[PDB]
Amino acid sequence: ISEMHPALRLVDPQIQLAVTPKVYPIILRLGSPLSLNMARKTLNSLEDKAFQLTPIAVQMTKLATTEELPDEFVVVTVK
Amino acid sequence: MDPKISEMHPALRLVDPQIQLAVTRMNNVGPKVYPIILRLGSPLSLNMARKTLNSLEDKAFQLTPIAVQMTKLATTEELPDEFVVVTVK
Numbered sequence: 236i237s238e239m240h241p242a243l244r245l246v247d248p249q250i251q252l253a254v255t256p257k258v259y260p261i262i263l264r265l266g267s268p269l270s271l272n273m274a275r276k277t278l279n280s281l282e283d284k285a286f287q288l289t290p291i292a293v294q295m296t297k298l299a300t301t302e303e304l305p306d307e308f309v310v311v312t313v314k
Numbered sequence: 315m316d317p318k319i320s321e322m323h324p325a326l327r328l329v330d331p332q333i334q335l336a337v338t339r340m341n342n343v344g345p346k347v348y349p350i351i352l353r354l355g356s357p358l359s360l361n362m363a364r365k366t367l368n369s370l371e372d373k374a375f376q377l378t379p380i381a382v383q384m385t386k387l388a389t390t391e392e393l394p395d396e397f398v399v400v401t402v403k
């Protein structure tokens with residue numbers, strides 16, 4: 236693992252993928268950067284809408300061993 | 315700035331709700347699930363992984379692809395009241 240490129244990155248399990256519902260820890264393979272924002276509609280007119288974004292800080296860790304890997308997880312590969 | 319939500323650059327797609335993002339937060343504590351909006355600066359792929367053998371000296375993992383169904387939106391009426399935006403690249 237500590238030699239793969241893009242390296243494997245384990246996302247803090249505060250953020251997981253809900254799949255159908257089971258939730259899975261996330262492993263990232265980032266060939267390009269990713270960003271995550273929470274979005275909330277703050278203005279709702281049929282002619283105009285506004286969305287408030289809030290950046291979500293995501294703690295990750297580069298994996299060195301497979302003993303760190305969960306028993307079930309999703310791998311997201313970004314090109 | 316783009317003319318319509320159906321032709322943004324990079325493309326905007328709503329991930330079909332069989333796949334959502336679970337964020338633990340907050341009444342009580344627990345996970346809330348959010349629809350995922352993608353801004354597709356680059357392609358992505360999803361694999362389901364399972365550790366099928368948990369022996370220290372002989373571990374094995376099984377990977378199964380997950381088809382990510384996505385939807386092009388026609389108007390902003392299709393944006394949910396709350397969602398997460400994953401921006402690639």
Ligand SMILES: CCCCCCCC
Pocket residue numbers: 246250261271293311329333350360382400
């Ligand atoms: C924090 C990374 C989220 C992964 C998004 C997956 C979109 C199908």
